[PDB]
Amino acid sequence: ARALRDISLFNDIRKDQNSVKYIPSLSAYNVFNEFPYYPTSASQLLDGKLDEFLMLSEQYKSRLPKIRKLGWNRFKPIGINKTMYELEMLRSRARA
Amino acid sequence: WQVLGECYSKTGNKVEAIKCYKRSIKASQTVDQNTSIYYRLAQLYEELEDLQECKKFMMKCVDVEELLEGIVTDETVKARLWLAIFEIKAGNYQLAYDYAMGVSSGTSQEIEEARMLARECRRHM
Amino acid sequence: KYGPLGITNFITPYDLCILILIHAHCSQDNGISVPTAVFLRLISPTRPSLEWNPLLKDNSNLRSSSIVPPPVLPILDNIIRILLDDKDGNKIALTLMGYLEAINGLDSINRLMMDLEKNCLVNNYRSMKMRTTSTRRQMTRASFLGTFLSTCIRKYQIGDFEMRETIWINLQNFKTVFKHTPLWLRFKDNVHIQKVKNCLLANDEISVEDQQMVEFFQHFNNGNDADSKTMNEENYGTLISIQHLQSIVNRQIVNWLDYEEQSGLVFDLLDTLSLNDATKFPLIFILKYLEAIKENSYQTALDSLHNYFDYKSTGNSQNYFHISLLSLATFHSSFNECDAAINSFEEATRIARENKDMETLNLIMIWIINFIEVHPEYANRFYITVEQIIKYLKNSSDVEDANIFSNAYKFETLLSMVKESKTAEVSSSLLKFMAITLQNVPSQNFDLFQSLVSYEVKFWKELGYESISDVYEKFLSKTSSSSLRNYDSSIINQDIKVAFKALEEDDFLKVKQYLLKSESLELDYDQKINLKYLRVKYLVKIGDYDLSMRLINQYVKECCEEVADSNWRFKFEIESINVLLLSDVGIRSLPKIIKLIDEYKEIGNPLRCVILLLKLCEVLIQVGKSMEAECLISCNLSTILEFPFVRKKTDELLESLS
Amino acid sequence: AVAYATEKPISTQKWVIQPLNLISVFPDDTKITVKAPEDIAHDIVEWGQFHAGVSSGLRISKKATGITGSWIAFNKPKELDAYHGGF
Amino acid sequence: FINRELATPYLDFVKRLCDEAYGYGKLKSELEALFLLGEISCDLEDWLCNSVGEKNFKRWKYLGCEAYQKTVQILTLIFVPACERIIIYVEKLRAILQAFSIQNKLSYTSDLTAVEVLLKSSQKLLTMTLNSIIGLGRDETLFEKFFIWFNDRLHEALDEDYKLKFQFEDDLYFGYDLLSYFDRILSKKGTEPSSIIDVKL
Amino acid sequence: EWQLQINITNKIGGINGDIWLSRDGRSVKWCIEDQCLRQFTYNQKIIKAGYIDFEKTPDCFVVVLSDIAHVYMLKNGGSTTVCFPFQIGNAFWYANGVILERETSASKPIEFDLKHKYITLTDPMAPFGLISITNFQLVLFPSDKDKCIAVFLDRNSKVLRFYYSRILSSSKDIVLTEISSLKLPDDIIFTRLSSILSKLKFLSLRFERREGLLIFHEPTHFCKIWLIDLLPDVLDSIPFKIYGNSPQNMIRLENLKLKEPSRIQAMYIHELLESCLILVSEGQNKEEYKACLYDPFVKITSPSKNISEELTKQNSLPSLQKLFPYPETSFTKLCFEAVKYITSPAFNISFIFLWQSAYSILLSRANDDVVGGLKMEHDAFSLVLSLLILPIPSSSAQEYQEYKEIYERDLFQHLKQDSEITSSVLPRIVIGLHLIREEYSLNVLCRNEHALLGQFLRFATAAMGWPDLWQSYYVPKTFFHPLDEPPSITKSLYSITENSSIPLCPFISFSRLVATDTQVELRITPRSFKILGLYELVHSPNFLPDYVLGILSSFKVDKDELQTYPLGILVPLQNILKILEDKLSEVRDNLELLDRADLQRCSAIINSIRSDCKVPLAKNRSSKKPSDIYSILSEIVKSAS
C-alpha cells in the first residue's frame, strides 16, 4: 500500500516533473424490539463485520443507567403532584 | 424443473434447457399447467433456428385454449399471432385466417396485429 | 487436552492465565519479572483482527518480518511448557501453578479483578509520577498490556452472574484436565507452590468453622463420585474468543500453504464446533477447502467454498458478491475447467458495475490476465484484449496503486517476450517491472518476486547466458507454485525436468512410461507444450521420422494460430531442421533457416543467431563442401564459445573437421 | 462529424465528457472569459452543452459491443445536466 | 559512498543521541518496560524532552528514511546492472581466450582458472546483493512501525493532552516488529558501522 | 488399502485410467498411475465407478450410490445428479447407458421382485426406459458396443441363458432373445449378492465376426468357452430373433487345450493386444506362477513359461499386462499389419507368439550394448522369418546352440512341420515386405529403416533361390516365385510419363493377391496409391495446370506430404504450383496448398459469408535508442499520471 509515493525514488521524480452505507446482519436483529441495532461509530465495524462483543458492550452500557433513570419523568408519588425531574431542576436553581 | 430451465435459458445453455423443460412437462399432473412451458419452449427452438420443430409445440399451446373452453390467456395470444405470421410465409392464407379471429380478444396491440393480418389474408383468400 | 470447542465473548480460562502472570509481574513482592518474550507470545494472538481474503490476495501483509512463535492453545499443559523451558522458568511456572491453586472460588477470581482495576491499572502517565507511594508497579491504559487488561476488565463487567458462574465451572474443568497428565506428576509437590499459595491465601478471616463448610460447598459441586453427581448441562472443555481463534487458523493455513506446531490437536478441536461457532467464525469452512484441494476432491471442495461465501457475505457490510464469483472462478481454473470459469467470471464484471465502486474493478482486471497468463489460448474469448488493459493500468493513477504498476509492467514483459519484440524493448520493459518490485518490500509481496525470478531466468536463458540464469535460479522457489493453477502443478513441473535429464542420460524406458501419463493428465498450457515438445525430442532419438515430421509441423502450425507464441515456434522450428539434416536431406531446410537468420539478425538475440549458424554449418558439411564451412566456422569461432549448452555440439563438430 | 467512429469503448473504462470552455484568447493574450447569463442568453450555454454531449456520444463506433443498459447508468454523472442528455 | 554518506551519518546520529546521552543497555530495558507497561522514569523523560525533543525527532526520521530507501535504490539501480554486465563481459572474456587457444594452436597455453575464479566471485556477488535488497526491505517495515509508535510516546511526554491517533489494534504482531527493531539498532553488533549492511563483506 | 476395479468403462478398445475403492464403499479415486485426480467421498455405499459415454458423445465419470447417481463431466462442463424410483442392487455398463438391478432382499426374511428390476438410461436428463425380453440375475452384460451377447443366470434353476441383445434408441431401449443354455456343474455351489457373483468369472471375446464367452470357476477348476458365429444373413432373419431357433452348427462348447486345465489360478484379457488373446496364469508351487497365452477361436496357444509370483494379485494387473511384449514403435507395426492382411489368423497369432519369444530371448542375450531401439524389433523380425525359412541346423551346430530356446518350442515345430504354409505363404510375406520397402522409398524422411529392410530381403532371396533379377534389384550394379519381375513405383512411374524410353508397364500391386477391397490396401501404402493416381491424372493429354489443385485436394495431399519426396516426383509438381502462384487471383477454393495468405484469407472471408470464419488481423510489426535507467524510470512515472 505504498501508493507509489512512499517510494523515495518516484516521489522525487514527481516533485521534479511538477516544475459507506450500512445494512443490518442477521445477528444484529434482536428478539425483543424489531428495530435492529445500528452501530454508533465505524470503529465498532471491524472491516465491514459487526463485532458481536462490541455491539453487546454498548447494549450493556445503555441498559445500565436505564435502571437508575427509572424514576425520572412519568413516575409520580402520592401526596406529591410533581415528579422528581424538576425536583432537581428547582434544586439546581436554589444554589445558583 | 421449470426454474432450472429458466436458469439454463438465462446462461446461454439452450441445448440443455430443452431437455429440462421436457422433463417438467411429464411431471405436471394437469395439462393446463403446461401452457406457460409450451410457449417458452417454442422460443428456444426459434433461437436454435429449426422453425419446423417449434411448430409442434406451437400447436399444443394453442390447442390447450380449445381444450379449456376458450381460456384466452396472454401467453396463447402471442402464440396465435406468431403462428399466423408463419402461416402467411407458408402460403396457406385460409389456415391462417381463423387464427387471427380467435385471438381478437387480447391486448390493444394484440388485436390490431391480428386485424391487419386478417385483412391481408382475406384479400388473398 | 482435547475437548469440545466453543466461542465465548467472556473471560476464557486462558485469559486468566495471562491475568495470573501479569499480577505476579506487577506486584514486585516476589521479584519475579516475566520475560518479555513470554508476554509477546501470549497477549499478541488475542490482539484484535487480522482479516484474510480467501484468494485473489496472498500474504500481502500477514507475513511478519520477524519470525514469530506459533500461538498457544488454551490448555495448561501447553502454557506451562513455555515457562518450564527456562532453567529458572520452574520458578516462573510454579508462580502460575501456585496462583491457580490459590483461586478456589468465584470470590477469589473477583479479588484478582478488583485488585488490578483499583491499584495496578492507571488512567494516564500524568498520575504515574504522583503515585510514587505505590508498592506495586502501575500500568498505563495505552501500553501494550494496558490496552489488553482494559478489554479483559471490560469483559468481566459485561456479564451477569450466569457469566461468572460458567467461568468457574470451566476453569476447574480446565484445571483438573492438567491434573491427569504426566507433567503434573513430575510437579506433584515442589513446596514453592505451598509458599506462594500461602502468600495470597492469608487474611482468610476464618479457619475453624466456615472453612469446614467452604470445603463442603466446593466438594459437593465437584464430582466426588461417591454418589451420583449433581446433574448439570454439558460444559465445553475449552473456551476461545474469536480473535484468538483467528490467530490459530491464520497461522495454520499459512503454515499449511508453504518451535513445533500441533496439527493433530488443532484439527481435532476445530472439528467439534457446535455449528454455531462456525457461523460466528466462517473461516473454519475454508480450512476444509484448502485441505480438500490437497487430496483433489471436487464435490467436497465446492460445498465448503460455497459455505464460506454465504456466511461471509452476510457478515460483511460491504458488498462481497463481486468477490465470491472470482474465487469460484479461480477454483474452476484450479481444476482445469477453464470454459466453466469464463462464464462465472463474466457475471463478476456485471455485478461490479452495479456497485459503482472503482477500487474493485482494478482487482477484476488484475485477475483477468492472470487467468490469461496461465491459459494464453483463451485470450481471444475475453471481451477485452490484453493490450487494452496494459494501456489502462500504465496510466491508471499516480497514488493509491502501489502494486498495480508492478503487476502492469510484468504483463507487458510477457506479452513483449511472446511477441518476439526487439530485445531493446524487452530489457527496458523488464527493467521497469524489476525496478518497481524491488523498490517496495519484496518479502511481503512474495508472489510477484517469484514471478520476477521466473521471467528473468527465462529472459536470460533465451539469450544463452546460463551464468546469469544460475544466479537467479537459486532464488526461484520450488513447490510454492501459485494460486489458480492446480495444486499438483509443482509435482508435474519437477517431473518434467527429470524426464529431460533422463532423455540426456538415455533412460528411454523412464521417458516412455512418462509419455503414457501425458495423454490422460489434466495439464496447464505451459506444461502442455513442454510435454508436447518432449514427445518430439524423444521420437527423434528412436529413429522414426515419418511420424515425427508429420507431428512437429502440426505443433508449430497450432503454435502460430491458437497461441501466438514465437519462442515456442522457434524451438519447434529448429527441431524440424535437425530431423531433416539428420536424414541426410538438409537441403530442403535451406529456405527455412535463411529466412530465420536475417529475421533474427534484426532482433539481435545472439543465441538465435549462433544456433542457426551450427545448423547451417552442419548442412554445408553433409553436401561435400566442408571447405567453406571450416572457413565460416573459423571466423565465428570466437563468438560461439560464449554459449555453454552449444559448446558440446560445437566441440563435437571440431573433432569431425580435425 | 469530425469524430464519427474514432474512439472505442472498454466497457469497464469510464467515459468522460469535456465541459464547454467558451473562453476566448486574443493575439494580445489578454484573456476574456464569458460567464452566463449576464453575457449571453442562458438557454444558449447548455444548448451548446447538449450539442457537445451529442457529439461525444456519437463518437462511439457503430460496431462497438458491450454497451448495454448498465453501461450508461455506470457513466451517469450522478447529477443530470445537458452533457449527459446529449451523451 | 553509502558507507560514508548514508550509513555512517545515520549511525553517528543514533550513537550521539542514545549512547552519549543515556546509554544502550539501560535504554533497551527501559524502552521494553515503556512498551509493555508505560513506566517512564524521571531520567528517561528527560531523555525524551531534552535529548531527543521535537527537533531531533524529525531529523531522526529524515536521516533514517534516506538511510534505507536510498540504500535500496543504489543496490538495485547500480549493483545489479553492473554485476550482470561483469558476468556478460567475463563470459565473453573466457570465450575469446578459448578460441585463440584452438585457432592459433600455439604450443604455450594460458590457464583459465583466473577467469573461472572471477566468474564465481562475481556470481557470488549478485546472489549476495539480492539477499541485502530483500533484507533492507524487511528493515523498512521494522523502521516505519518503530517511529509510528515512537511518535506517540514522544508527543505524550511533551503535551500531557495528546490525543492518540494510531492504534495498536491495527496489527496483531505489532509488538514483535517493534521489539525486533530494538535488537537490531541497540546491540553490540548494532554498534558496529556494518549494522545497516555488511559493508566489510 | 485400496482395491482396483477390472472393467469400468466401454471405450471400444480400452481407456488409460484407474479406479480405486477404499476398504469400505465410501471413496472413489480416479488416479492415473500415482497422481490422485478427482476424488469423491460419500456416506452411502458406492456401487460402481463409470467414465462411460451417454450417447450424446460426452466424456463423463459416473458413480452410482444406493439410490443416487452422480455424473461428473470431465472433458467439459460441471456436475449433474439424478435419482431413481427405487433402490438399486448393482449397476452394469453397456453401450451408451447403464443397466440397474434392483436390491433383492435386506433386513432375515428373503423376499424379492421379478416382474421388472432393470432400468435403462441413456443420458441423465432423459427419463428412464424399461428392458424387453421375449421367449434371473444379470451376471454379465455386453459393455463393449462391438460385442452383443448378454448372460443371464437364475439362482434356483442354476442354468444360463444366452441372449443376442441389440440396442434401440430414439419406453423399450434394450431387447433380448434367447439362443442357447448351459447347465452348471453339480460341484459348483454358490451361497451378499456380489460375493456370490465374485466366485464366478466371465470374460467377453470377439474376433472378426466370431465371438466367444469364457466361463471360469476357480474352486472347481471349471473352464469352458461358448463360441458363436455372427452370420449377417442368420441374425437378420425374422424367425431367428422372435422364435429363438438357432442352427446347431453355430453353437459349440469346448474346453481349453492346455497341459493342466485343472490348475489355473486366474486369467485376464490382453488390453494391449486387441485380438482374442487372453492372459492365463498357472502355478506349480506356492512361490512360483507360470503365465502362458492362448487363443479361444484358433487353437494356437503360446507356451512362454513366464514366472511372476507377487504379480498374481489383482492390484498388480497392469504390470502383468505390460509383462508380455508387443511392438510399440511405428515401423514394425505396419509389418505386423501387412502380415495380418496377407496371412491366415492362425499363422498370424502364432507369429506374434514367436516374435514375442524372440524379443524376450534377444533382450536377455543383449546386455544393453549401446542404446536399444528400432533395431531391437527389426532383429527379432528378421530372425523369426530367417528361422522359419532356414532349414533347422544339426543339434551339434553352433547356430543351433545360440537359438535352441526357439527350436524346441511347439509352435515353431508346428510352424515348420506345416509344408503348405511354408510353401506358399512365405513368398507372399516377402512380396508384401518388398512392397512396404518400396512404399518407404517414396518417403524421404524414413530412408534409414528402408535400408534395413533391404538387408533382410536380400537374405530372404538368398534363402529361397529367387532369380538373380530380384537379388540384383538390391545391389547397385523350395517355393516358387509368382512374380518374375520386382514391382516398383519408380519404374512404373517412369513408364507413365511423356518422352519415356521405357515401354508401358503396370505396377501389379498386391491389391489382387490380397483378395480384399482397395480400402484395406489404402491404409498400408497410402503414398504409393496417391502418387500413382496423381500421375495417372496429370499426364493425361487433356490436362491443364488449373485442375491440379482439385486433384491434390481430392487426393488428401497437404504441404507436409508434399515436402517429403525423394526428388523426382517433388520437382515438377512444385514447379506446377509455382506456375499457379502467378496467374491465380480469383479465389477458386482449396487455397491451403499454396503459400499466398491473402487469397486464403479472402476465401475464408467468403466461405464464412456463404455459411452464414477467422478474420485473423495482421499485427503491425513496428520497430531505437536504449537510453539510460533514469530516463526510463522518469518516463513511466510521467505516463503513470
Coordinates of C-alpha atoms in Angstrom, one line a residue, chain F residues 25 99 103 123 139 146 181 211 214 216 230 262 271 392 407 410 460 484 506 509 542-543 571 573 611 617 628:
Chain F
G25 CA -17.6 -48.3 -0.1
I99 CA -28.4 -51.2 -16.5
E103 CA -31.9 -54.7 -4.5
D123 CA -28.3 -39.5 -20.5
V139 CA -24.2 -61.8 -14.2
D146 CA -18.8 -54.3 -30.6
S181 CA -28.5 -72.5 -22.5
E211 CA -17.1 -64.1 -30.5
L214 CA -15.1 -67.5 -21.3
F216 CA -14.3 -69.9 -15.3
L230 CA -22.4 -63.8 -36.4
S262 CA -7.5 -78.0 -13.7
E271 CA -5.7 -55.0 -23.1
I392 CA 16.9 -76.3 -38.9
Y407 CA 13.8 -74.6 -31.6
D410 CA 5.9 -76.4 -30.0
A460 CA 15.4 -63.8 -47.9
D484 CA 9.3 -62.9 -62.3
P506 CA 1.9 -51.8 -64.7
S509 CA 0.2 -54.1 -56.8
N542 CA -6.2 -33.0 -71.9
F543 CA -4.6 -31.8 -68.6
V571 CA 10.3 -31.2 -58.6
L573 CA 4.6 -30.6 -59.1
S611 CA -22.0 -20.4 -44.4
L617 CA -5.8 -9.4 -38.2
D628 CA 19.5 5.2 -19.6

